[PDB]
Amino acid sequence: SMSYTWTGALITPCAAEESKLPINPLSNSLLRHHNMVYATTSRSASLRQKKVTFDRLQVLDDHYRDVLKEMKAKASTVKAKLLSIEEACKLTPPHSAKSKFGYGAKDVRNLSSRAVNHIRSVWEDLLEDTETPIDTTIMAKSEVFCVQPEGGRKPARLIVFPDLGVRVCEKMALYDVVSTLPQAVMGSSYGFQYSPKQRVEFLVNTWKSKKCPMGFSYDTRCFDSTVTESDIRVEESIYQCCDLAPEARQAIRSLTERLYIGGPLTNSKGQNCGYRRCRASGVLTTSCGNTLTCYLKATAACRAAKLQDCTMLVNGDDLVVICESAGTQEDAAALRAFTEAMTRYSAPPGDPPQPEYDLELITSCSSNVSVAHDASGKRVYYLTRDPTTPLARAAWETARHTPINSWLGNIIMYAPTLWARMILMTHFFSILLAQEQLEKALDCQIYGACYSIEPLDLPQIIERLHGLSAFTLHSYSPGEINRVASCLRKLGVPPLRTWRHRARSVRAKLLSQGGRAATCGRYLFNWAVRTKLKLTPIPAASQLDLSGWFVAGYSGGDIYHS
């Protein structure tokens, strides 16, 4: 069975596609080598199509069934609620793709008669029809990267999603399930429950619990394409262990057969492009589904491989396992056996995995633990990453208007990092000052969910999320310092010392404004003065609403929070 079948109809764009930085960047002030920055377009879709299209052979064993049953017994403790139309409507991002049935995201959020009417009709239809495949749209996604160190460019990812009406119904039937079940099933292994500070803590603690730790990330090639119809049905079998309202159970059953296992792909012109028999990227269960499936196959493969004292951390298709070593040679062998197992379960690797005996050298979720020191000199651990993509996208978002602001997300998730503090914070606060946009809330994504956040709130958010040490870190590791340096060289970003300069001015302009703006000056930019102003815990940090921030992943799920 093929992940995809294609009729020949093109994957088409819906509007003009921008592929390059504007002719004279609105901030060469961030980045000089504009030619290094690019966005993906539908022009590269057929390249992705070729990579993403293959036959899935799948052989399940006793290990897999054992783990599945263990997973199901945990799911059996769960009681899930049906969401009302209203609650599901309020989870719809203001800029979610409009319905073909003559209403859009705003109409849904407003509970307009036409939208609510269609939605209800889509719900009844899930009860009245348990078989007919539900239409989807396939599109080339727009994402910005830095060119490979070789005119090497990634082709566009392909997104597949059903109509806005179906999407609201998914929320009603499955939002509570996808938010609750994964922690219930996978426990400490479910990544999305963790803030950056909590994730690093769990990693570092797992590391130390091993007499002699060995760790490895595992990169599945095109995970979404490796998800089989069987995988999707096993996923449902897990879901079905929840206590569920009768209509939720039927909605789940119908959605599974009519939407999740596959169905026809329609381009933006309304032409039939082909047929999907693998995971769709743009449905509510994509993150939860991918996580359960990765966890299930990986845990079974750990048993097949006789890996010992495995502790896994799973985020959708991102997998990192830490275990007890048996010697360099036996580790290598066991890992090869882990890979042959995952392969039989239909998940071959992209890059073959490698045992790693230094926690700091393992990268998972595009990130790695590193070490620095706080004011008191004490050792502090934090999560970082190669800043290349974050910087490219910051430059793109500076030059072209963008609906979602990755830079704000990266500042929140990576607030303690050397590059987020010196470049990103300095750069964007400067722009915001000049345009008096400091008070205006912006949209950003955290674990796939959309949030609307006021920049004048970063100090609180950062403190409660990362700790007061997020404002004092110094003596960053050599490797980190080199990685950043190399990156500024690549993209033509001015050197750190220059940012220290721009920072002093920004910080001074902030302090002169008093109030929240002043707090941003003291806390966010205290790294820029040698006369380091003593930083005490912020009053607001404690009395804010940061609950729903790290509960579950909603990547591709059309989810809008608060």
Curated annotation (Swiss-Prot):
Co-factor: note: Binds 2 magnesium ion that constitute a dinuclear catalytic metal center.
Binding-site residues, Mg(2+) 2: 219, 317-318
Topology in the lipid bilayer: Single-pass type IV membrane protein
Organism of this sequence: Hepatitis C virus genotype 1b (strain HC-J4)
Effect of residue 404 to V: In strain: Isolate pCV-J4L2S
Subunit annotation: Homooligomer. Interacts with non-structural protein 5A. Interacts with host VAPB. Interacts with host PRK2/PKN2. Interacts with host HNRNPA1 and SEPT6; these interactions facilitate viral replication. Part of the replication complex composed of NS2, NS3, NS4A, NS4B, NS5A and the RNA-directed RNA polymerase.
Residue stretches in coiled coil: none
Catalytic reaction(s) noted: RNA(n) + a ribonucleoside 5'-triphosphate = RNA(n+1) + diphosphate
Activity regulation note: Activity is up-regulated by PRK2/PKN2-mediated phosphorylation.
Full protein name: RNA-directed RNA polymerase
Requisite cofactors: Mg(2+)
Function: RNA-dependent RNA polymerase that performs primer-template recognition and RNA synthesis during viral replication. Initiates RNA transcription/replication at a flavin adenine dinucleotide (FAD), resulting in a 5'- FAD cap on viral RNAs. In this way, recognition of viral 5' RNA by host pattern recognition receptors can be bypassed, thereby evading activation of antiviral pathways.
PTM: The N-terminus is phosphorylated by host PRK2/PKN2.
Location(s) in or outside the cell: Host cytoplasm; Host endoplasmic reticulum membrane
Ranges of residues in domain RdRp catalytic: 213-331
Residues annotated with Phosphoserine modification: 29, 42
